[PDB]
Design a protein around this ligand. Structure first.
Ligand SMILES: [K+]
Ligand SMILES: [K+]
Ligand SMILES: [Mg+2]
Ligand SMILES: [Mg+2]
Ligand SMILES: [Mg+2]
Ligand SMILES: [Mg+2]
Ligand SMILES: [Mg+2]
Ligand SMILES: [Mg+2]
Ligand SMILES: [Mg+2]
Ligand SMILES: [Mg+2]
Ligand SMILES: [Mg+2]
Ligand SMILES: [Mg+2]
Ligand SMILES: [Mg+2]
Ligand SMILES: [Mg+2]
Ligand SMILES: [Mg+2]
Ligand SMILES: [Mg+2]
Ligand SMILES: [Mg+2]
Ligand SMILES: [Mg+2]
Lengths: 118, 206, 262, 153
RNA sequence: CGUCGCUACUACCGAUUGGAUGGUUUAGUGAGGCCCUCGGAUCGGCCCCGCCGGGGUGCCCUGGCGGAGCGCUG
RNA sequence: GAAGCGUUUACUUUGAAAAAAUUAGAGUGUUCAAAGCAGGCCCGAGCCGCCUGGAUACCGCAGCUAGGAAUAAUGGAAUAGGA
RNA sequence: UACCUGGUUGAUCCUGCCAGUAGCAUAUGCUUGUCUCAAAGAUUAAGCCAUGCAUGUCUAAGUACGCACGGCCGGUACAGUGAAACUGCGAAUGGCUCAUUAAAUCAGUUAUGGUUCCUUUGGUCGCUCGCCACUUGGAUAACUGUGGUAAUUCUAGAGCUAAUACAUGCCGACGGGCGCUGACCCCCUUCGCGGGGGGGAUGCGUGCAUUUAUCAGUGGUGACUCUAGAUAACCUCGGGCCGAUCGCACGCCCCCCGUGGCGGCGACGACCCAUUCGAACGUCUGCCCUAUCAACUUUCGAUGGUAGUCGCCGUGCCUACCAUGGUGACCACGGGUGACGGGGAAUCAGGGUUCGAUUCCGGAGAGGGAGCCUGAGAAACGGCUACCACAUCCAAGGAAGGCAGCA
RNA sequence: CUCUGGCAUGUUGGAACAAUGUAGGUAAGGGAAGUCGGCAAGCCGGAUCCGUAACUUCGGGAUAAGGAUUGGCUCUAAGGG
């Protein structure tokens, strides 16, 4: 059972989870379902513990702090590319968008550009 | 939940009525607003047909009209003094459709001086000089001054009303429906209606 | 039920649709539109049981999608659009024009009309009222509303309306001695002249109408729809001229027609 | 007594009493106007309601009720309620098997406006259907006719 | 014609404050939803303003780390 | 052509509106019928298509409308508070 | 087709029942060659259910950076087909059953001048003077990657990315006009005063929708406390509208120029009005058996008044204060029904007597109750929550149920 | 429980706090298994609002049985001369 923020008790409780709370996706509009969730305090009786580093140390963890994975795909909105690339106005906005290249063995190489909105 | 149906009642002859279906949504009732006096807290409840009803849990400012002067001003409610329905509603200071309340009379004083140019609500005068010395004189011309005394022969306020202007509070009756419209508009009491409610308040404690 | 009904059983369909009992269980169930579903023809029956252009429901689906059906000056792709009364069904690819008018037996009949007589349409004003800024409005027997009408038009009159503009070309006043057509009830589809309008406060008015042959009949005011100035109808009347004949004389009419054709 | 015999103040909502009575008009007595309407259907508004002082929001003439629907008559039976009376309607129910009739009655509680002061038990009253006034009241008294009387010994 | 005697069947009364199964309820407890009054695990924004900075020319246009303003507020 | 009835009803006739299906029943050789709402005319082959039907009746009681006023009930002028 | 016959007696006329006789409507028995229609787990159990299916949906026209394909034609934002997913809509229709239900349902009639209403159709969308607009902000899907769990259409953490999702927010029309406030100025009876009129600088509000109060009376009713006007104001941060949307051919203007301005056909969208489909509560009349049910209702609303609350709205629907009412031998109230109502079915002189679980209309219910989310519309159950009764899996820590749908 | 009035604890005091007693309480879990026998003790209890059966000499049974409430404080109404 996943652990939910704000439950504030070690153990499992049943909550009437509505839309967009957590640990639940509704099967239809307005559906609420009672599900079992785990409190936000950790103890011995936990399978896993998702942890996020917030700052770097002295060296690199083997297999973790190396071979950085790129963001799968760049910005799409005509303003989210300007913030990333410091576009001012009408500085060839279309071309500055990131063009993802596609390389499959059973095909010719080719790069694919996305449709930019707004 | 709370049901507004007619089939749970006894029929006219006094016999018992057996329901032929369970409760339906269109015959529902919601809990009372029980509007209080305080900082504005208005809740929105969605009603039949996707429309919106404004639950007014707390009000402090209302839109009350003089009526006899065709003067409507956005003023502040002080408290509730009388309620024809229940005496408890006054005790808990609850705003309903027809309860009479005390409202601040400053906006009506401001309009009165700026329209009639006669001291109203003042006790002895020469106390708010930086503005009142200017409103009374205005050093105005021949026609405007001639336009102000033609507003003087009809300039007169009832003794009951002017007495309340001395106290700084006017009692007025709500005309709207807090809990439905989310606002507490009303009218200022004059004439026989004002005398009737003053007698009722006096009989309550006097 | 818990909400709107969107089915119509074949047996429960209106009689003037003239549907049979064996093809299926359901009926077109016309969509919402300018006319009530009891006195409207869905396009599906009009192109399948009236003109036999389409054989099944999907065949009349293809013809509507190709956009040649043009009701009241507008192309309509709805398979179950409620046509209604005196609406111009213009199919320009075939060059035929139809004005939807009840026959003598209270049933809508195929009334082929000339192209230039399809450019206008008659309409019965139902409610007259003034809107904001003091603008007078006018709603007709259709769900069509217009602004700024001639102040002489009152309720239950007739307005001469031309298509593609929506303006009032002319109007017919409701008065004694005016040709009309009955649009509901037993006398539905009878052409005649107003003779008397008796009124009942708080209830429906009753009017008395005499036809060309002299037969006098009465009906409610809500079933009156004046289509002529005095005597001269403003529209090409269908075959039979909106005259009602009893069981005695259509029989001998068949025998005469059969004998002549035999 | 007068018209103020309760916890609230009665007044016809369409009438403004406090019409700025100043020295240009003699005070008093400026008689307040009275709201009254013709209810239609040929019924004549009684003179008592034209010029009386009573307040009745359910009165057909001086209140906010519209008569529409069925108009029917009855006989006054009891008058032991406030501003409302019960009338009895007698009719005959036909039975096909015996080809004979069967006498039946239905009591109706109707609102009686104060304009009809001269109402005893046994009179003929014509009532018109209005919106539900009470739990069992849907008709309002429109005309009162005496029951072979008009003279009392 | 009736009592009496034998045999079957049908109901009736009957201690057992008999028993069983339904229905409507008093009282007590009372899940759950909804409303109100609180509550605030968290999640943002402004005040960034220790700094390198700086431009119409220490008077910052700012490129960002960063303390965190130990507040104002959603 | 606008207004009222010099009573109020019951009664009778007329008209309106009264779902369809079912019933009675009009038309129609389903190969006959129960059914169904279809179908029929010519073609010399251009018939580059013509004529129809999908009626009508009944729908009790209650409600609405317009005529009649014989039977039945109910009233008008008696302290005249009468026309 | 308006029908009778046998049986009490030694025998006769009757009363009177029993039996016979015909139909249809359930079962059953025997038999059964053809063909056209055609009812069918209603009756007892609205008792219990394994399994499978029964509600999903994309046009050129909301959002495609899946290689899952593919035109590449090669230096370009997006060729095109498109899985997935977000979004919108539907899932409240249909189908099944008849348990409840006796002025209740339902039928005919009438009203909403006492209300709500997705959609369709037609109106309305420059009516408001008030350093992004050549287009603003943040997240989240799908997707990559790390898992947990015995198990589920269970999901967490991490990393991206869009909108007709979610928010924010202009220009423009726009020049002004109107109503108040009125600096002053001008023409004035002039005369030593009043003067009768004009302009007007400066400030305040201006539109539709809402909530009040007031004034007058362009259209409409049988009748508005109608519609429309005029004034004073309000206009709710879980807060109304005043288009930051998407395709199709592509064109005109070129003074200023030359790089902009103009353009048609649609789609989507909306505050509000009308319309359509309705829905909801009401008016009058009408229901089977029972008096070994004659007096019921009223503390706990029973009948009515006043003022409110709540509801979409009218109403004891609820609350407070009052009045003591209201219904009954013209059968109230109570009880029973092997009662869902009606259209209709059987029988057929006429009159009637039975029958309508059952294909059409209306209602009710989804194992029994109760309570809710979303939505225009549900007290929904092929939606959720809880309890009761049954019942499934489990690694015993939990999880999942509703065939009176088709089989 | 107290005031007026009265008294000195009933023909002795002091120190201890064993058994047995006399008088008075409490007792987990069970609940008459104790006993001739519920002896003794225990339960209940006032008032207000409900609600009350068989039977009956119609008077009764009846406080039948059974159930709810009860404090303090701040008020609000009604009942007079
Ligand atoms: K001792
Ligand atoms: K014992
Ligand atoms: Mg776009
Ligand atoms: Mg039953
Ligand atoms: Mg049935
Ligand atoms: Mg249901
Ligand atoms: Mg919707
Ligand atoms: Mg349910
Ligand atoms: Mg002692
Ligand atoms: Mg001593
Ligand atoms: Mg002694
Ligand atoms: Mg013990
Ligand atoms: Mg114990
Ligand atoms: Mg023993
Ligand atoms: Mg023993
Ligand atoms: Mg004892
Ligand atoms: Mg006893
Ligand atoms: Mg207390």
């Amino acid at each position: 059972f996943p652990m939910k923020q704000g439950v504030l008790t070690h153990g499992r409780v049943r909550l009437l989870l509505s839309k967009g709370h957590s640990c639940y996706r509704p099967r239809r509009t307005g559906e609420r379902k009672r599900k079992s969730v785990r409190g936000c305090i950790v103890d011995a009786n936990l399978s896993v513990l998702n942890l996020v580093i917030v700052k770097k140390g002295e060296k690199d963890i083997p297999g973790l702090t190396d071979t950085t994975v790129p963001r799968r795909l760049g910005p799409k909105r005509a303003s989210r590319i300007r913030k990333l690339f410091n576009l001012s106005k009408e500085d060839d906005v279309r071309q500055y968008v990131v063009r993802k290249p596609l390389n499959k063995e059973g095909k010719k190489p080719r790069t694919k550009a996305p449709k930019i909105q707004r | 939940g709370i049901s507004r149906d007619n089939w749970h009642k006894r029929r006219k002859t006094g016999g018992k009525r057996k329901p032929y279906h369970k409760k339906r949504k269109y015959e529902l009732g919601r809990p009372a607003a029980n509007t209080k006096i305080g900082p504005r807290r208005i809740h929105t409840v969605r009603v039949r047909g996707g429309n919106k009803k404004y639950r007014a849990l707390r009000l402090d400012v209302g839109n009350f009209s003089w009526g006899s002067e065709c003067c409507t001003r956005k003023t502040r409610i002080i408290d509730v003094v009388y309620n024809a329905s229940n005496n408890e509603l006054v005790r808990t200071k609850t705003l309903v459709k027809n309860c009479i309340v005390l409202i601040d009379s400053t906006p009506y004083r401001q309009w009165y001086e700026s329209h009639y140019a006669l001291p109203l609500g003042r006790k002895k005068g020469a106390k708010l000089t930086p503005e009142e010395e200017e409103i009374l004189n205005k050093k105005r011309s021949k026609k405007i001054q001639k336009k102000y005394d033609e507003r003087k022969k009809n300039a007169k306020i009832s003794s009951l009303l002017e007495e309340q202007f001395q106290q700084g509070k006017l009692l007025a009756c709500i005309a709207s429906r807090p809990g439905q419209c989310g606002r507490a508009d009303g009218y200022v009491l004059e004439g026989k209606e004002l005398e009737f409610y003053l007698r009722k308040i006096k009989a309550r404690k006097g | 039920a818990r909400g709107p009904k969107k089915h119509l059983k074949r047996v429960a369909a209106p009689k003037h649709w003239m549907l049979d009992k064996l093809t299926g269980v359901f009926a077109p169930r016309p969509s919402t539109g300018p006319h009530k579903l009891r006195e409207c023809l869905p396009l599906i029956i009009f192109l399948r049981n009236r003109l036999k252009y389409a054989l099944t429901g999907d065949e009349v689906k293809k013809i509507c999608m190709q956009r040649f059906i043009k009701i009241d000056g507008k192309v309509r792709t709805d398979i179950t659009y409620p046509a209604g009364f005196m609406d111009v069904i213009s199919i320009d690819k075939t060059g035929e024009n139809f004005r939807l008018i009840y026959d003598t037996k209270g049933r809508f009949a195929v009334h082929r009309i000339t192209p230039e007589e399809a450019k206008y349409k008659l309409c019965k004003v139902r409610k007259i009222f003034v809107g904001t800024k003091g603008i007078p409005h006018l709603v007709t027997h259709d769900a069509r509303t217009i602004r700024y009408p001639d102040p002489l038009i009152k309720v239950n009159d007739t307005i001469q309306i031309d298509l593609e503009t929506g303006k009032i070309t002319d109007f017919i006043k409701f008065d004694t001695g005016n040709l009309c057509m009955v649009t509901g009830g037993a006398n539905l589809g009878r052409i005649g002249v107003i003779t008397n309008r008796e009124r009942h406060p708080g209830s429906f008015d009753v009017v008395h109408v005499k036809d060309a042959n002299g037969n006098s009949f009465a009906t409610r005011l809500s079933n009156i729809f004046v289509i002529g100035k005095g005597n001269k109808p403003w529209i090409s009347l269908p075959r039979g001229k909106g005259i009602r004949l009893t069981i005695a004389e259509e029989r001998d009419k068949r025998l005469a027609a059969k004998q002549s054709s035999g | 007594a007068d018209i103020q015999t309760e916890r609230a103040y009665q007044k016809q909502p369409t009438i403004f009493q406090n019409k700025k009575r100043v020295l240009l008009g003699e005070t008093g007595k400026e008689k307040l106007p009275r709201y009254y309407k013709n209810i239609g259907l040929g019924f004549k508004t009684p003179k008592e309601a034209i010029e009386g002082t009573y307040i009745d929001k359910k009165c057909p003439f001086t209140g906010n009720v519209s008569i529409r629907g069925r108009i029917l008559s009855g006989v006054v039976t009891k008058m032991k309620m406030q501003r409302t009376i019960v009338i009895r309607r007698d009719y005959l129910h036909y039975i096909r098997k015996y080809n004979r009739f069967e006498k039946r009655h239905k009591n109706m509680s109707v609102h009686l406006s104060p304009c009809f002061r001269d109402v005893q038990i046994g009179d003929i009253v014509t009532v018109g259907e209005c919106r539900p006034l009470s739990k069992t009241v849907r008709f309002n008294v429109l005309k009162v006719t005496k029951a072979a009387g008009t003279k009392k010994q």
